[PDB]
Amino acid sequence: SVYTLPAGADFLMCYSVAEGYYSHRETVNGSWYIQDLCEMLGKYGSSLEFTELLTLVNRKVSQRRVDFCKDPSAIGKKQVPCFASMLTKKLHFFPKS
Amino acid sequence: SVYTLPAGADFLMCYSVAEGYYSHRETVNGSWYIQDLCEMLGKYGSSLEFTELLTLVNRKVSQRRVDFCKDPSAIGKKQVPCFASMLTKKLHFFPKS
Amino acid sequence: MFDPAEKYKMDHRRRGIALIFNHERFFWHLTLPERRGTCADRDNLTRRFSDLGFEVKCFNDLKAEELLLKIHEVSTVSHADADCFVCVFLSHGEGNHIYAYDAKIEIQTLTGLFKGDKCHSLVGKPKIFIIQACRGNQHDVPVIPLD
Amino acid sequence: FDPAEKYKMDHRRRGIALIFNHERFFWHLTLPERRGTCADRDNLTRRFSDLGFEVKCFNDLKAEELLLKIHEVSTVSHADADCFVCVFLSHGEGNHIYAYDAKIEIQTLTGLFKGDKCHSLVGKPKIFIIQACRGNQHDVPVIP
Ligand SMILES: *CCS(=O)(=O)N1C[C@H](C(=O)Nc2ccc(OC(F)(F)F)cc2)C[C@@H](c2ccccc2)C1
Ligand SMILES: *CCS(=O)(=O)N1C[C@H](C(=O)Nc2ccc(OC(F)(F)F)cc2)C[C@@H](c2ccccc2)C1
């Protein structure tokens, strides 16, 4: 390259939820976000562009609702995750030789 | 179709800079971010996935440096933009029928 | 069945509205620098979004009352025959606030108008906010890859 | 200018995935136990290991330990690595993540990997993953 990079470039911040919201979990099987993240990593981690995969994670988490909770006002409530990209290129995890 | 959506889903927040940083401009030709956003919209707006396009915007803005500024401590400084996706699907602006 | 290539439905009668709030000058007692060249940004965004099929609606140097009325109005019209909604702020910011001509507005008040429970006709559809504003007082520094 | 440009991912190693897993907290923080986090930790360990990452897990570190460990990884050479991954499984507050005993500014943690502090990751992806609440609002369901 001819060009310098900003020191803050090529960061990707992947959050379970947008600012100001509660995140959710199954009783003991783990968080909505990490469960769906891991499922998409298992199926697509080695092929899809990572932010393309994080978008699938957003859709999977968006399908869930709170079925049981001690706070009864949380029942039926929802969650969308949020990723913040300062990436400058396509990110793939193709199998390494 | 069977599932409800979170009310906060399908938002995309596109920022000129990451939290805590200054954004930059040419003398009177406009901001780095909007100039590069518009160039990428002109070339790729109607074909590429929008977040894929915003990543190109991040690379273009990352290539710039401050050449002239009244604050001499800004000279040679850099900028990366940041987009925060709560989108659940691929977003294209294909020509409409 | 789960389709990784699923796209937003973008075959509605209209692309939708692109709202542009363009702020060049500020109420003197805010002591905010003029944003000379923002009108080039506004015009450039207007051409580009118009070519993608958007109905572009531009407003220059609105005060908080005017900006809040205009954006509330667009939030309450039907987008049912639109693909998506675009909202651009060209201004100064402070924390989670964008500046109108005379005062700052909580960004969450503005995006909140388009949440699914407030704007039923945009449920399932992309709501895209674009913000040209500084987000603090730090300059990012140049670096080069380790060869 | 190539619109299809990919990060170079043909280095000797994929790189390190750091997982900070917080199940229990110092009693006086009055923070609920994170039952199921160990399933998340193990699940992320399998998935990132299968993608070629060297997965390094740390359970219920106090602020001093967490800051030492992450500073350490920031100061080792990543020159022969594709990228860096850092996972926090904990509670949060504003721009803070909780260790066992206290909260840490997330910007202190990401700041260690900025180009001016970590030269061997310049031009390479730095991926932060955070399972934490970011406020006290439940998002509400809606229908097409
Ligand atoms: C040489 C620094 S500057 O660009 O004059 N400026 C940086 C920052 C600012 O206002 N940036 C900015 C970016 C894009 C803009 O859009 C445009 F108008 F279309 F070009 C406008 C403005 C902060 C500025 C500043 C000046 C005085 C006191 C504090 C901060 C300087
Ligand atoms: C039904 C409410 S809850 O899920 O018990 N809870 C929501 C929130 C919270 O702490 N959630 C959460 C999500 C994922 C986690 O990771 C995991 F361990 F892998 F599952 C852990 C925790 C806030 C909770 C709360 C309770 C009391 C007072 C305030 C907030 C409730």
Numbering used by the authors:
A (entry chain D), B (entry chain B): 196 to 292
C (entry chain A): 30 to 176
D (entry chain C): 31 to 174
Mind quoting what the paper says about this structure?
When tested in a biochemical assay, enantiomer 3a potently inhibited C6 activity with an IC50 value of 8 nM, while its enantiomer 3b exhibited an IC50 at least 100-fold weaker. A complex X-ray crystal structure of 3a showed similarities and differences as compared to the binding of 2a. Both analogues engaged C264 in a covalent bond as expected, while the trifluoromethoxyaryl side chain of both analogues was buried in the S1 pocket, where the aspartic acid residue of the C6 substrate is usually bound. To accommodate this large and hydrophobic ring system in S1, arginine 220, which formed hydrogen bonds with the aspartic acid in VEID peptide-type inhibitors, is moved by 4.2 Å (ε nitrogen) to create a hydrophobic cavity complementary in shape to the sidechain of 3a. However, the location and orientation of the piperidine ring and sulfonamide function were quite different in the two analogues. The phenyl substituent present in 3a made few, if any, contacts with the protein, but by occupying an equatorial position in the bound conformation, it energetically stabilized the required axial orientation of the trifluoromethoxy benzamide side chain of 3a, as bound in the S1 pocket. The potent low-nM inhibition of C6 WT protein by 3a was completely lost with the C264A mutant, further establishing that 3a engages C264. The potency and exquisite isoform selectivity of 3a, together with the lack of C6 activity for its enantiomer 3b, strongly suggested that 3a inhibits C6 by first forming a pre-covalent complex that positioned the electrophilic vinylsulfonamide for subsequent reaction with C264. To better understand C6 inhibition by 3a, we determined kinetic parameters (kinact/Ki values) of inhibition. These data indicated that indeed, both noncovalent and covalent interactions contributed to the binding, with a Ki value of 7.0 μM, providing an estimate of the intrinsic pre-covalent binding affinity of 3a for C6. None of the remaining seven putative off-target proteins were proteases; all are membrane-associated proteins, including two heme proteins (CYB5B and HMOX2) and one cysteine-dependent enzyme (PTGES2).
Caspases are cysteine-dependent aspartyl-specific proteases involved in a range of cellular and disease processes, ranging from apoptosis to inflammation and neurodegeneration. Caspase family members are broadly classified as inflammatory (C1, C4, and C5) or apoptotic caspases. While often classified as an executioner caspase, the function of caspase-6 (C6) in physiology and disease has remained enigmatic, and it has been suggested that C6 may act upstream of the other executioner caspases. C6 possesses a non-catalytic cysteine (C264) not present in other family members and is situated on a loop in the small subunit at the distal end of the active site. The catalytic cysteine (C163) is found on the large subunit, while two additional cysteine residues appear to be buried and thus inaccessible for disulfide formation.
